[PDB]
Tab-separated table of C-alpha atoms and ligand atoms in Angstrom:
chain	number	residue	atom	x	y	z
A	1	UNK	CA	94.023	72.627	132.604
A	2	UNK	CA	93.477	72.690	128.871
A	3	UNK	CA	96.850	71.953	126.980
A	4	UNK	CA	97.517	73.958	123.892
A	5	UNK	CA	100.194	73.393	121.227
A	6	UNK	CA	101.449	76.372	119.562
A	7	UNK	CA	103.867	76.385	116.612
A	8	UNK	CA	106.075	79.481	115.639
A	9	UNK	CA	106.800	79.130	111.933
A	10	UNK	CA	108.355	81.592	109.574
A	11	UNK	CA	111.108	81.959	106.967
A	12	UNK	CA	114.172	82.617	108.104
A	13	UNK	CA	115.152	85.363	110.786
A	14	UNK	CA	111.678	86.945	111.200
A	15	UNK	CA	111.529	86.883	114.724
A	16	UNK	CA	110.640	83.285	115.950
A	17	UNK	CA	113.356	83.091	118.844
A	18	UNK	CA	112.853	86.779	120.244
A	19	UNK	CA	108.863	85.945	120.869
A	20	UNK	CA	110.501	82.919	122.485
A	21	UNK	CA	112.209	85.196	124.786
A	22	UNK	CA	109.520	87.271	125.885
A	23	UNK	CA	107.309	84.252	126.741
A	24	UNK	CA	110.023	83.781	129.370
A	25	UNK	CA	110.005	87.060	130.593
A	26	UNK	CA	106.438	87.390	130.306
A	27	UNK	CA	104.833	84.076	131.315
A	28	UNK	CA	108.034	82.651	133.207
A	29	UNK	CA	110.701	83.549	135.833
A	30	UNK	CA	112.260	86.034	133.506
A	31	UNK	CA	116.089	85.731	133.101
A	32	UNK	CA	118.541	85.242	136.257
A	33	UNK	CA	121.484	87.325	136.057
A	34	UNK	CA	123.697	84.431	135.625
A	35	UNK	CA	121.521	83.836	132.414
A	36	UNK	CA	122.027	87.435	131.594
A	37	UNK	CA	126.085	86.361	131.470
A	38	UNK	CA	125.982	83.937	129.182
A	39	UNK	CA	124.231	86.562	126.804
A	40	UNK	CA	128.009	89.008	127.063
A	41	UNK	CA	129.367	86.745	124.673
A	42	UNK	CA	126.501	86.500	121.791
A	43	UNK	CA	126.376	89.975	122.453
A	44	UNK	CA	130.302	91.079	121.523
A	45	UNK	CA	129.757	88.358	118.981
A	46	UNK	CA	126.914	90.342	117.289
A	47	UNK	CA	128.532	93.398	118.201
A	48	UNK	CA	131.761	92.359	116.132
A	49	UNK	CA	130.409	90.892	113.162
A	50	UNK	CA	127.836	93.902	111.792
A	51	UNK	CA	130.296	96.557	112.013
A	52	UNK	CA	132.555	93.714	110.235
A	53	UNK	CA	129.799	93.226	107.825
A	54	UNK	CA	129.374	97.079	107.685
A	55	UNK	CA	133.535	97.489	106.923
A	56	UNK	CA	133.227	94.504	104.253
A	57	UNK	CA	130.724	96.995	102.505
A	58	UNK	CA	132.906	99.382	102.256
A	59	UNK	CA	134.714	97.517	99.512
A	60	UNK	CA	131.800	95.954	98.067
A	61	UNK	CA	129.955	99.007	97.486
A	62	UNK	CA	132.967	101.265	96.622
A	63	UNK	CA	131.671	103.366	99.585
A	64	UNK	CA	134.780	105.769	100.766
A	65	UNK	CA	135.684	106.449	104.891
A	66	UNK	CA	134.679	110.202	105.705
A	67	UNK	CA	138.385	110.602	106.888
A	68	UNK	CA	140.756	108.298	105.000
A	69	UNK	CA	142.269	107.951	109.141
A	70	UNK	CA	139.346	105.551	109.128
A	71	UNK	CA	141.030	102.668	106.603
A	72	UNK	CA	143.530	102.325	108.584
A	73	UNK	CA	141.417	101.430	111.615
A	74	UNK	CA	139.209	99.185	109.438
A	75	UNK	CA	142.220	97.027	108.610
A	76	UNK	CA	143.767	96.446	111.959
A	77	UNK	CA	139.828	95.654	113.230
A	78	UNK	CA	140.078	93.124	110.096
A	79	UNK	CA	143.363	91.690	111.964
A	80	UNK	CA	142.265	91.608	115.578
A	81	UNK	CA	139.220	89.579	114.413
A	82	UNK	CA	140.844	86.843	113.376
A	83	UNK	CA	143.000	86.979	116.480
A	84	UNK	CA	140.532	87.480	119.269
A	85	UNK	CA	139.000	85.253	121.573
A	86	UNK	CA	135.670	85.139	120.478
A	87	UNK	CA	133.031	86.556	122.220
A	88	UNK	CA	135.083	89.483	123.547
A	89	UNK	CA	135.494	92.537	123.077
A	90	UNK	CA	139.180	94.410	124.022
A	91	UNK	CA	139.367	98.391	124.775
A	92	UNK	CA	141.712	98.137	121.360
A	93	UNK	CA	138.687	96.641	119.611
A	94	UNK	CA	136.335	98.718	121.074
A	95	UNK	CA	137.984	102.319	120.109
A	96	UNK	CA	138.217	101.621	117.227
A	97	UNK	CA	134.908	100.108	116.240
A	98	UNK	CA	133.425	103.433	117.799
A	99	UNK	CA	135.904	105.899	115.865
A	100	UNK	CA	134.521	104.183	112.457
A	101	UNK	CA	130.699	104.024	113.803
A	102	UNK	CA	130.842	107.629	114.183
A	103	UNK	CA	132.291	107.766	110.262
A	104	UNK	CA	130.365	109.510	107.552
A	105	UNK	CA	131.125	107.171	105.272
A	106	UNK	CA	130.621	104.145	107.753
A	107	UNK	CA	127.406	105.406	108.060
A	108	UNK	CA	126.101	106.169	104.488
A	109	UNK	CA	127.457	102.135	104.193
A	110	UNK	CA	124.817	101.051	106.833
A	111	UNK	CA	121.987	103.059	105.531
A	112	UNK	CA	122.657	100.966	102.708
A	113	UNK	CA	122.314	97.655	104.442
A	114	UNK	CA	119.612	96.391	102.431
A	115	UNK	CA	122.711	95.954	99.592
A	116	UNK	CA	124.222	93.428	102.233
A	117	UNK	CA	123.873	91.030	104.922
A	118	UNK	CA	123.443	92.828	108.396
A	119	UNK	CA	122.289	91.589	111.749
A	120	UNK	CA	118.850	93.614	112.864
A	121	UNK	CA	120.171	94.703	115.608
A	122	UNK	CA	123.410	96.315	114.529
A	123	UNK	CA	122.251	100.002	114.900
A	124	UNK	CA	121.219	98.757	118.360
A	125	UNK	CA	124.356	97.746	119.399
A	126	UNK	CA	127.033	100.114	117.904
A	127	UNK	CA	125.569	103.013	118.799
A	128	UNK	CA	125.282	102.374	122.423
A	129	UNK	CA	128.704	100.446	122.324
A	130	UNK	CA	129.663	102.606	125.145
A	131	UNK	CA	127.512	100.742	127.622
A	132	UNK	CA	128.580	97.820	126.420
A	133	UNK	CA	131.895	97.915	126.733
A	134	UNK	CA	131.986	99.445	130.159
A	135	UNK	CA	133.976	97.274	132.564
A	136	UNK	CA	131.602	95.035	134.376
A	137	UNK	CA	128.995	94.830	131.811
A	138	UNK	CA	125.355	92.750	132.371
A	139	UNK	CA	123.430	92.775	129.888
A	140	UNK	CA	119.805	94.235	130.037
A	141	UNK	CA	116.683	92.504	129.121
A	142	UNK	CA	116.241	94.206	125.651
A	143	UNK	CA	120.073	93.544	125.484
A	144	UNK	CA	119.233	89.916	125.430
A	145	UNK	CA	115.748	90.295	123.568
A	146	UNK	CA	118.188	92.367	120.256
A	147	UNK	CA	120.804	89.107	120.379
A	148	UNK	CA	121.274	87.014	117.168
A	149	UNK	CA	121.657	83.263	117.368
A	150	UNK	CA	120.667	81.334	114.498
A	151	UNK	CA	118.603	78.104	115.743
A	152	UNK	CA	118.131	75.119	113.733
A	153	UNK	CA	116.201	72.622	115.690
A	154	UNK	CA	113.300	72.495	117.493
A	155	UNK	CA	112.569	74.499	121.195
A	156	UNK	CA	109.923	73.500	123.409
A	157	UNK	CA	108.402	76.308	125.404
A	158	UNK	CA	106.118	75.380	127.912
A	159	UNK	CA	104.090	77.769	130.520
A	160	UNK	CA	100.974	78.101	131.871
A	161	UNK	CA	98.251	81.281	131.269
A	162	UNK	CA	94.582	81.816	131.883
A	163	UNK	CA	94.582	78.279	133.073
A	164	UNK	CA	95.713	77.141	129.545
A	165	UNK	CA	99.108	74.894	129.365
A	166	UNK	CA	100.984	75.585	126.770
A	167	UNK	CA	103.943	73.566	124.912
A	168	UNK	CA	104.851	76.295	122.122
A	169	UNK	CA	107.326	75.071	119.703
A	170	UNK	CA	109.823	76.915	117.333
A	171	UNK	CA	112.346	75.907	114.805
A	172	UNK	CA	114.636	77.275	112.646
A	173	UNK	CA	113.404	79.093	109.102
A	174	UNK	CA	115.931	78.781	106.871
A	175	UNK	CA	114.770	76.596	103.938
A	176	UNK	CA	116.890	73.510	105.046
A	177	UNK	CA	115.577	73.344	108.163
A	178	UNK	CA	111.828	73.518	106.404
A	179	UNK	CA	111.994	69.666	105.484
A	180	UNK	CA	111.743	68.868	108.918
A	181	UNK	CA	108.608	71.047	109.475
A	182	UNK	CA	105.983	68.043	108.712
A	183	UNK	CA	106.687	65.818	111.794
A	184	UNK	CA	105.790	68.427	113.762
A	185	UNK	CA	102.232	69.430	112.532
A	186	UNK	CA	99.937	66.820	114.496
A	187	UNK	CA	97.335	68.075	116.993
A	188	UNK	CA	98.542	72.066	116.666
A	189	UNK	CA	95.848	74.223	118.438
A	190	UNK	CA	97.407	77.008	117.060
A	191	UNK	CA	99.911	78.255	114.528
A	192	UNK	CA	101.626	82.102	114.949
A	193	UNK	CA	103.279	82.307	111.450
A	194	UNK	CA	105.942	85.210	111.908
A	195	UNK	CA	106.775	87.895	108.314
A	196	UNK	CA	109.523	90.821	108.720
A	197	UNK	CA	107.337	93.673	107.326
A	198	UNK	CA	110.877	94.977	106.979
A	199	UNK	CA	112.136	92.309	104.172
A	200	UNK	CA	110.170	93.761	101.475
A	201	UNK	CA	113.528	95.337	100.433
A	202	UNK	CA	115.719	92.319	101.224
A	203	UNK	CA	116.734	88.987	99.759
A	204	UNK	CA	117.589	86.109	101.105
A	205	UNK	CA	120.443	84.843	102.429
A	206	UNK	CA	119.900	81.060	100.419
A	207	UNK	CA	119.524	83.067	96.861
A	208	UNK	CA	120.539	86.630	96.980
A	209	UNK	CA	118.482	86.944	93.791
A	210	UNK	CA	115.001	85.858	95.666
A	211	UNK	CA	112.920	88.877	97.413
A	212	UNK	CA	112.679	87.711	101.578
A	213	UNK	CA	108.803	88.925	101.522
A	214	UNK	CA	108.328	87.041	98.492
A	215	UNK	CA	109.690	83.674	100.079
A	216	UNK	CA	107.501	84.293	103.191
A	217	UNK	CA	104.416	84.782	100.861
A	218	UNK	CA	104.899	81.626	99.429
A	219	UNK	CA	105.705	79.826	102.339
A	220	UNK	CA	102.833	81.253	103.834
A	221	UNK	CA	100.685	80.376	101.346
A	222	UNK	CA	102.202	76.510	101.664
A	223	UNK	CA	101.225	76.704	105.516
A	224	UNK	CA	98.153	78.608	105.516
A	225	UNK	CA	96.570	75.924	103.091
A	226	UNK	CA	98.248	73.303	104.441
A	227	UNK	CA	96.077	69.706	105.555
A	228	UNK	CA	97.372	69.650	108.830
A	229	UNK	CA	96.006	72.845	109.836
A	230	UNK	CA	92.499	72.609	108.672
A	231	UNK	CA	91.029	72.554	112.210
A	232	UNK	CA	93.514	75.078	113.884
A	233	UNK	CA	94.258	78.385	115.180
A	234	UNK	CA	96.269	80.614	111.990
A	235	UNK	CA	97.846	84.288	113.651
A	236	UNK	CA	99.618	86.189	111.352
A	237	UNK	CA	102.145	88.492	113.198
A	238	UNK	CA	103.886	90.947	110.852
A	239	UNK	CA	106.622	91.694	112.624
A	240	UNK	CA	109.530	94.574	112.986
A	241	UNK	CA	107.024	97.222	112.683
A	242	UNK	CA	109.730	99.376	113.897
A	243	UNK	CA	112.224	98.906	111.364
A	244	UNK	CA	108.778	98.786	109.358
A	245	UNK	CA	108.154	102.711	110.186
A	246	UNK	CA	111.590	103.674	109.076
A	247	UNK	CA	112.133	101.667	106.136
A	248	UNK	CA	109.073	102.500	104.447
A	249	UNK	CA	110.265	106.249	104.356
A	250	UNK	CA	113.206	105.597	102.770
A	251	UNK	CA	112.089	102.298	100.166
A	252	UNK	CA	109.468	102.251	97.991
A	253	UNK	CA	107.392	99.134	98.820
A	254	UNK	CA	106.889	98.983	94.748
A	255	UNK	CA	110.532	97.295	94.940
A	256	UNK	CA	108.468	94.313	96.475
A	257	UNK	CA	104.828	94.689	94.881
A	258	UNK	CA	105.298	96.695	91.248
A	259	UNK	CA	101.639	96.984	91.671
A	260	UNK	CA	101.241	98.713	94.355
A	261	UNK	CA	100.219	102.568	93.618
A	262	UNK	CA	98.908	103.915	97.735
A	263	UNK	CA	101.204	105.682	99.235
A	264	UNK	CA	104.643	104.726	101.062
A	265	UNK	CA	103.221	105.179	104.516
A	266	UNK	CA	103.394	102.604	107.459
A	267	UNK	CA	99.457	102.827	107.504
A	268	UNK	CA	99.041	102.182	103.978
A	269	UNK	CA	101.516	99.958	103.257
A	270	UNK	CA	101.100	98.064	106.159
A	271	UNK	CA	97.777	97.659	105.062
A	272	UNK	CA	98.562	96.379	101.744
A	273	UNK	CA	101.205	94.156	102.813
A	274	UNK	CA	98.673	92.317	105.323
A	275	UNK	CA	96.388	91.909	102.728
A	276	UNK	CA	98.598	89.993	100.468
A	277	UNK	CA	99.201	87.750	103.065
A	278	UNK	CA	95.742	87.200	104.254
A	279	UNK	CA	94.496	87.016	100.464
A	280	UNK	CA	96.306	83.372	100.397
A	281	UNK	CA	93.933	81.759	102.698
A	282	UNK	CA	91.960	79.702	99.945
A	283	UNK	CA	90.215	78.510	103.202
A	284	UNK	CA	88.778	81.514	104.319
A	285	UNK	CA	85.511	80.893	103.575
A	286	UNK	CA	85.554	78.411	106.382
A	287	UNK	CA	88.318	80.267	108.665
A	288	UNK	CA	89.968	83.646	109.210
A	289	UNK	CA	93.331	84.026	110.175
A	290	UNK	CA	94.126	87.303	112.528
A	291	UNK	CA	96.703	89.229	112.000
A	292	UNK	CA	98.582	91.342	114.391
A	293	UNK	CA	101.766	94.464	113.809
A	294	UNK	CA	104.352	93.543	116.320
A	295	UNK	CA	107.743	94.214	117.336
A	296	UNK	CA	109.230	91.056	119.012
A	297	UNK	CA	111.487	92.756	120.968
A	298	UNK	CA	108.549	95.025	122.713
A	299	UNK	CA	107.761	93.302	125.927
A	300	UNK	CA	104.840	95.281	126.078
A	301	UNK	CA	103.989	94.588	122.883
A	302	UNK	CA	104.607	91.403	122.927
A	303	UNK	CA	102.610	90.588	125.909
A	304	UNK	CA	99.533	92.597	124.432
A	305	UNK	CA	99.430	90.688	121.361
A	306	UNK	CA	100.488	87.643	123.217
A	307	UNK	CA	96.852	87.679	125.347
A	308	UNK	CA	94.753	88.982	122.358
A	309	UNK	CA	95.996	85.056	121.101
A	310	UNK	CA	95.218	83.502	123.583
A	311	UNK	CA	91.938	85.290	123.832
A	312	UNK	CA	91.006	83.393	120.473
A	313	UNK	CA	92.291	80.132	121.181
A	314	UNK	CA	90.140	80.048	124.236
A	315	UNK	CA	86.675	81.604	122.008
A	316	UNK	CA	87.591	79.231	119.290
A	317	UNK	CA	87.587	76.162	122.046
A	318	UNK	CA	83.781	77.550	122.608
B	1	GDP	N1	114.074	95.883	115.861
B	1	GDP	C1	113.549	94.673	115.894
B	1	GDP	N2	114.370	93.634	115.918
B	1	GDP	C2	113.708	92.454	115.942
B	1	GDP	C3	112.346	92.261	115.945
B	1	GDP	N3	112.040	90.899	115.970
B	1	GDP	C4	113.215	90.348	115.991
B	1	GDP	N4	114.280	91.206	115.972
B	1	GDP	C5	115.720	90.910	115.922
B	1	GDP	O1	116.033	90.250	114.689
B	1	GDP	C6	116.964	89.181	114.917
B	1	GDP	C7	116.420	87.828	114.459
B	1	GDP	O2	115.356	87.385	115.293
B	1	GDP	P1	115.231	85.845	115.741
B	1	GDP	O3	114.139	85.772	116.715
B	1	GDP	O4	116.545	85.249	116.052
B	1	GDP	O5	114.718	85.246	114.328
B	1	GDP	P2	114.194	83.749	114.038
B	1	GDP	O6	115.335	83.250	113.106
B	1	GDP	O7	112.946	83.796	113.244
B	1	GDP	O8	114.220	82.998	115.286
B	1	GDP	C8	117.345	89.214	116.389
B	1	GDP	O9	118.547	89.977	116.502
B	1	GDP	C9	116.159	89.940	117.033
B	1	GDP	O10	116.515	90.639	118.230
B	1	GDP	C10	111.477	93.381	115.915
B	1	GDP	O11	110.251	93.383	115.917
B	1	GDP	N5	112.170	94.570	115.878
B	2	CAC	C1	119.308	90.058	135.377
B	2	CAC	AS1	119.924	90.542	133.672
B	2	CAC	C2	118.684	91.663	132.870
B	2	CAC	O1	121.568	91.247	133.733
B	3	CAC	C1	110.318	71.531	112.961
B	3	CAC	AS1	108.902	71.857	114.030
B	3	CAC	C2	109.250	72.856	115.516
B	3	CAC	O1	107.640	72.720	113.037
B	4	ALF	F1	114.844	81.356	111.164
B	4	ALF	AL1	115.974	81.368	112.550
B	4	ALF	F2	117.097	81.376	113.947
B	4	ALF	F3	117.194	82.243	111.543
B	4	ALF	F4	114.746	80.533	113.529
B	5	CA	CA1	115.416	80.989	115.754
């Protein structure tokens, strides 16, 4: 009936492409298993380059294996990676890739992967590498939903829910790809602006020396105020509340917000963190954005969230 135009905006790998996903499980056919194929690749691609990025670590934070056996391994996984087909994933590969995820040492490194570069869904992965590499291999849905692909241009998404026809559109964060944004922004009925609640710790991958949270705020605060979006639908969805939950155990948020003096708990912190987000809306006197916890990869989640949206699209069209 009514058509709606959604945009999914957000810095750099916050979760844009894996809501994406889950509007084509949810509010589509889902995935064919052919689809589910082309995923095997992007999957031992993944697979291969965290516990690379993990082994690189190793070095770079003068982190020693738990058994010196270990090294060796590390090197000759070093060797077959250049030598590979990529994509795949060979029983020589894979043995040894699980001998050093199961390493002390190896796994002190990855706790520390806030020091580094490390795809979100390593942990994922590695430790069910088993299953993975099992001859005949499909991939599962959440097998798909953890994959890392980094998109640059622009998607168009369209489906149909509560009568409302929706063309949702995503592009790629990373500040290069930002320029573009603009020629996208006429006639948005709605904007779902995606933050990591898990970057508070990080930096970015454009300037190592630049706090990710910090970059969203401010890019936030650019769209939030923005012209364009005077007369349209703001959700704020701060994802990886899962990674959230852990994290926040382990890091002080203060290494994000000095100020901050509550407590380190996913309640409180979560809390805060929202607020500083919300707090940029110099328009709120005339509109309120909603905010929502998510975890992208959470179907269920997801699809919860997904209605509550649509919900207020449809009230705000009253
Ligand atoms: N654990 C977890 N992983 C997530 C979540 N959202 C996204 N990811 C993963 O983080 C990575 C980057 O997400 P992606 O959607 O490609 O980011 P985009 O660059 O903003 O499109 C992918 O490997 C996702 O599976 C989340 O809520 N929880
Ligand atoms: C159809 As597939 C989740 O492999
Ligand atoms: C570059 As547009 C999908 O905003
Ligand atoms: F911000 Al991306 F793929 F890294 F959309
Ligand atoms: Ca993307």
């Amino acid at each position: 009936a009514r058509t709606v135009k959604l945009l999914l905006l957000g810095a750099g790998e916050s979760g844009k492409s894996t809501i994406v996903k889950q509007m084509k499980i949810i509010h589509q056919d889902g995935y064919s298993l052919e689809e589910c194929l082309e995923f095997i690749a992007i999957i031992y691609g993944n697979t291969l380059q965290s516990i690379l990025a993990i082994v690189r670590a190793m070095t770079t934070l003068n982190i020693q294996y738990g058994d010196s056996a270990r090294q060796d391994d590390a090197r000759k996984l070093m060797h077959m990676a250049d030598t590979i087909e990529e994509g795949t994933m060979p029983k020589e590969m894979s043995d040894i890739i699980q001998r050093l995820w199961k390493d002390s040492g190896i796994q002190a490194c990855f706790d520390r992967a806030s020091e580094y570069q490390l795809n979100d869904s390593a942990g994922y992965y590695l430790s069910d590498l088993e299953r993975l590499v099992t001859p005949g291999y499909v991939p599962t849905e959440q097998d798909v939903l953890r994959s890392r692909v980094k998109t640059t241009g622009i998607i168009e998404t369209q489906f149909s829910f509560k009568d409302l026809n929706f063309r949702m559109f995503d592009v790629g964060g990373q500040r290069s790809e930002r320029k573009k944004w603009i020629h996208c922004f006429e006639g948005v009925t709605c904007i779902i602006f995606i933050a990591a609640l898990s970057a508070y710790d990080m930096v970015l991958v454009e300037d190592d020396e630049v706090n990710r949270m910090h970059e969203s705020l401010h890019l936030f605060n650019s769209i939030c105020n923005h012209r364009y979006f005077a007369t349209t639908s703001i959700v704020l969805f701060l994802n990886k509340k899962d990674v959230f939950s852990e994290k926040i155990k382990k890091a002080h948020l203060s290494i994000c917000f000095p100020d901050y003096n509550g407590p380190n708990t996913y309640e409180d912190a979560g809390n805060y963190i929202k607020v500083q987000f919300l707090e940029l809306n110099m328009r709120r006197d005339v509109k309120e954005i909603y905010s929502h916890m998510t975890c992208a990869t959470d179907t269920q989640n997801v699809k919860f969230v997904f209605d509550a949206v649509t919900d207020i699209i449809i009230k705000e069209n009253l």
